[PDB]
């Protein structure tokens, strides 16, 4: 039983929880309702177990993709912002927080991979992937390299793979077709073939992981990398004169990085649904509210139209939003589990030389489709 007449909120330890607590302190000044913010470890695994018994926090903040699971389990209240409130946020973010065609959380922030580059080594960053091979060759003469990113995790390599028609599950009209998997198609093959050939021509290395990539950019050894907003503070400490821009295009088509939308759901078992609604709609999701959290720890790009526009004056944040908008939303369905392992494996297989691109993705398609059906 969740205690009536107060608000318990759960948010991760890398978000601006002290900022959020100030928004709660204002809410208390206006309502007399005390707001408590907690950042317990593995809150994404804890919530399902406590909310099942009708306990847990009144509000939970996490990436949207987990919320489709919670919703199916019957742990989230169906929220009701009117048409006027929905106009205040970017419509594509509302697509991320739907279960069975119903809204189940309030979008807060937007997260996606961007092209980070060294201004001193590369003043004008390339707009296309095809441009890299030639650019690596003139940098190799100076002892540097063009591009180093995490080639081990499909999250980092997917933007290029997806660019020409690769996709996880077909998103028809508010419904994910679990039977329609697109890791086998011509676009995916072309994307992965290009990546493999970058390794084949020694522009990149098949066993470059997150740590090796990041260290090489921060030390000024590589001209560019592909990483998210979590990486910026490290580069600030390194004092690398750096920019964040739109990801390079493949075959005239934008990279499609996966989009993670930080979202706030209301616990279905909360006796404080109306209080939570008020807090989230009229207190947090305002310029002043989001600014309080942002000042504590930066939110990156936010879903609120008005505040994003003030944030986007920082080109790094504008680039994030741009790559996010041209990218694909992370499916909030359970069948995504199969996707991750199968695609991760296929890229390793193609990069190391164990399998060719064709068969590696053909097998990965088979493995996702049989796991999604039976």
């Amino acid at each position: 039983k969740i205690e009536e007449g107060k608000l318990v909120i759960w948010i991760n330890g890398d978000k601006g929880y002290n900022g959020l607590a100030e928004v709660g302190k204002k809410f208390e000044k206006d309502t007399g309702i005390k707001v408590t913010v907690e950042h317990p470890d593995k809150l994404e695994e804890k919530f399902p177990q406590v909310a099942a018994t009708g306990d847990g926090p009144d509000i939970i903040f996490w990436a949207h993709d987990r919320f489709g699971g919670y919703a199916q389990s019957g742990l989230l209240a169906e929220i009701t912002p009117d048409k006027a409130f929905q106009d205040k946020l970017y419509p594509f973010t509302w697509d991320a927080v739907r279960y069975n065609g119903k809204l189940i959380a309030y979008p807060i922030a937007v997260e996606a991979l961007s092209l980070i580059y060294n201004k001193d080594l590369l003043p004008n960053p390339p707009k296309t992937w095809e441009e890299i091979p030639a650019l690596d060759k003139e940098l190799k003469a100076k002892g540097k390299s063009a591009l180093m990113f995490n080639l081990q995790e499909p999250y980092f390599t997917w933007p290029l793979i997806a660019a020409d028609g690769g996709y996880a599950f077909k998103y028809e009209n508010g419904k994910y077709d679990i039977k329609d998997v697109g890791v086998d198609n011509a676009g995916a093959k072309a994307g992965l073939t290009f990546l493999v050939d970058l390794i084949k021509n020694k522009h990149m290395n098949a066993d470059t992981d997150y740590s090796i990539a990041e260290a090489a950019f921060n030390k000024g050894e590589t001209a560019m990398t592909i990483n998210g907003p979590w990486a910026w503070s490290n580069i600030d400490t390194s004092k690398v004169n750096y920019g964040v821009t739109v990801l390079p295009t493949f075959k005239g088509q934008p990279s499609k990085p996966f989009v993670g939308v930080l979202s706030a759901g209301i616990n279905a078992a909360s006796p404080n649904k109306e209080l939570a609604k008020e807090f989230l709609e009229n207190y947090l999701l305002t310029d002043e509210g989001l600014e309080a959290v942002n000042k504590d720890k930066p939110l990156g790009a936010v879903a609120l139209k008005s505040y994003e526009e003030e944030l986007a004056k920082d080109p790094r944040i504008a680039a994030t939003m741009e790559n996010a908008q041209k990218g694909e939303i992370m499916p909030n369905i359970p069948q995504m589990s199969a996707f991750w392992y199968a695609v991760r494996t296929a890229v390793i297989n193609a990069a190391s030389g164990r399998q060719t691109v064709d068969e590696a993705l053909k097998d990965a398609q088979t493995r996702i489709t049989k796991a999604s059906a039976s």
Binding site: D30, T31, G32, I33, P48, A52, T53, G54, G69, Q72, S73, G74, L75, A77, E78, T80, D82, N100, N205, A206, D207, T208, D209, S211, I212, A268, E274, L275, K277, E278, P334, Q335, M336, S337, A338, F339, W340, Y341, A342, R344, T345, I348, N349, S352, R354, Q355, D363, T366, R367, I368, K370, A371, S372
Partner: protein
């Protein structure tokens, strides 16, 4: 001397707390906890009552702890295996029904409301956005369910608009008001700012059937699969589902499904081999080190001793990931050294056998201090004169070790080694963090890898594999691998 009557006094005082807590547990609704605590305490009191059960006094406290935190969790896991407890079916029936009955739909209009004081009483205003019409009630008092006739008005209320604070303080009483428009419509508080025609999505009939107030469709509990299903059954299934008994369905699925059975034998062999080599190498390395570091001639042993156990003093999690860095095929300082000397770069991740070597190297690094520390203490049980005797028989250091030290240690070490085998059999974490089970076993329709243990391949089916988190399946397989490792210890 302490009193003899004091024993019966303490046993009486403890015999009071039990019963005071037991009958108190019997109330509200804690039956399983009342029965379990009764048999446990009564056994404890009986054991200390008669002096004929003396030996049990030594065993009871320890067995009580074990039953509570080892056996009880064990039984639940087994229990769960006979149900469909999963992400999809996580709630009890009651909870699932409760969730569904809390569901609502907007049946009518929506009005922004204000609260206005009239002396010591209140006045409720509604604003119709779509017509620009405004409605206002007569003076009323808060408290309980009440219906208010609203009247269309052009005038402003006399009182000053109430704060959010005042609305919030009076929210319960406010939520019990049914507002009535001049045209007959009923409207209730749906938020702190709005009154609307929000209504329950379903109604509970009494015989079990739920019916949707929006579509007229009827649903009934299908306890075979654990869902409210339309009604003789229809094609539609309502979520959330509820946990329900499935008997052998989770156990048989490991025997039914070909494809999850294809690499079973091959994975099993590697898991057995991985464990045996780990146990052997850790015991051997640990035993020798323990021997060398008690050797009184060794003038630095006190320092050596500490440094040798540090791999066990640091939490293994970071260490494993650092090893993952060190073992990188192109980067990582191991192969940078094997490039300069010897001139070879082993495929620690790409090649199945070298990956298995890497995994064993890391595990031995992780596990040798455990065995070292044990031997450090176990070695103290060997009397020194046995080595005076062996000296008179003409033994050297190596002969001492294999004819006296080793055999005297393997007997107490035997149960510890059998335990270390079972632990490493299920060493999920290591394989996940270091290799993710890779490299990939090709042709495995349900994904398997070369360094995958049995646990790694299995929990991938249960917690990944696109079905959500199936706890019942993982519980059933946990029972099966337990029965396998228990049969192995023979």
């Amino acid at each position: 001397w302490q009193s003899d009557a004091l024993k019966w006094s303490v046993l009486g005082l403890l015999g009071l707390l039990v019963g005071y807590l037991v009958v108190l547990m019997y109330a509200q609704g804690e039956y399983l906890f009342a029965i379990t605590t009764l048999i446990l305490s009564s056994a404890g009191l009986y054991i200390f009552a008669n002096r004929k059960a003396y030996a049990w006094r030594y065993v009871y406290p320890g067995m009580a702890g074990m039953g509570l935190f080892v056996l009880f969790p064990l039984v639940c896991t087994i229990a769960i295996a006979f149900t469909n407890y999963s992400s999809t079916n996580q709630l009890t029936f009651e909870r699932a029904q409760e969730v569904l009955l809390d569901r609502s739909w907007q049946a009518g209009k929506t009005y922004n409301f204000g609260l206005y004081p009239a002396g010591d009483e209140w006045q409720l205003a509604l604003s119709d956005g779509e017509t620009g019409k405004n409605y206002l009630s007569d003076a009323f008092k808060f408290g309980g369910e009440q219906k208010l006739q609203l009247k269309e008005t052009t005038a402003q209320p006399e009182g000053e608009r109430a704060n959010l604070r005042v609305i919030t303080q009076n929210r319960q009483a406010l939520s019990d008001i049914t507002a009535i428009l001049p045209d007959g419509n009923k409207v209730m508080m749906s938020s702190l700012r709005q009154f609307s025609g929000t209504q329950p999505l379903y109604t509970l009939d009494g015989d079990g059937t739920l019916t949707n107030n929006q579509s007229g469709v009827k649903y009934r509990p299908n306890n075979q699969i654990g869902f409210y299903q339309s009604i003789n059954w229809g094609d539609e299934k309502l979520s959330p589902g509820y946990t329900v008994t499935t008997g052998w369905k989770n156990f048989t699925r490991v025997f039914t499904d070909e494809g999850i059975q294809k690499p079973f034998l091959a994975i099993f062999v590697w898991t057995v081999v991985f464990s045996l080599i780990t146990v052997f190498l850790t015991v051997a390395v640990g035993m020798v080190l323990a021997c060398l570091v008690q050797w009184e001639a060794l003038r630095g042993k006190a320092v050596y001793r500490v440094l040798l156990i540090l791999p066990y003093a640091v939490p293994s999690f970071i260490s494993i990931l650092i090893f993952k860095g060190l073992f990188n095929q192109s980067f990582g300082e191991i192969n940078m050294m094997l490039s300069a000397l010897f001139g070879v770069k082993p495929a620690w991740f790409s090649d199945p056998t070298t990956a298995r070597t890497m995994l064993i190297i890391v595990n031995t690094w992780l596990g040798y201090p455990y065995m070292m520390i044990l031997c450090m203490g176990l070695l103290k049980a060997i009397p020194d004169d046995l080595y005076e005797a062996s000296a008179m028989d003409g033994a050297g250091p190596f002969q001492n070790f294999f004819k006296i030290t080793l055999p005297l240690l393997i007997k107490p070490l035997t149960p510890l080694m059998i335990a270390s085998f079972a632990f490493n059999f299920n060493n999920f974490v290591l394989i996940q963090l270091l290799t993710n089970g890779g490299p990939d076993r090709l042709g495995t329709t349900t994904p398997a890898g070369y360094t995958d243990l049995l646990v790694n391949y299995t929990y991938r089916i249960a917690f990944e594999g696109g079905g959500g988190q199936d706890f019942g399946l993982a519980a059933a397989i946990a029972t099966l691998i337990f029965l396998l490792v228990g049969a192995l210890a023979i």
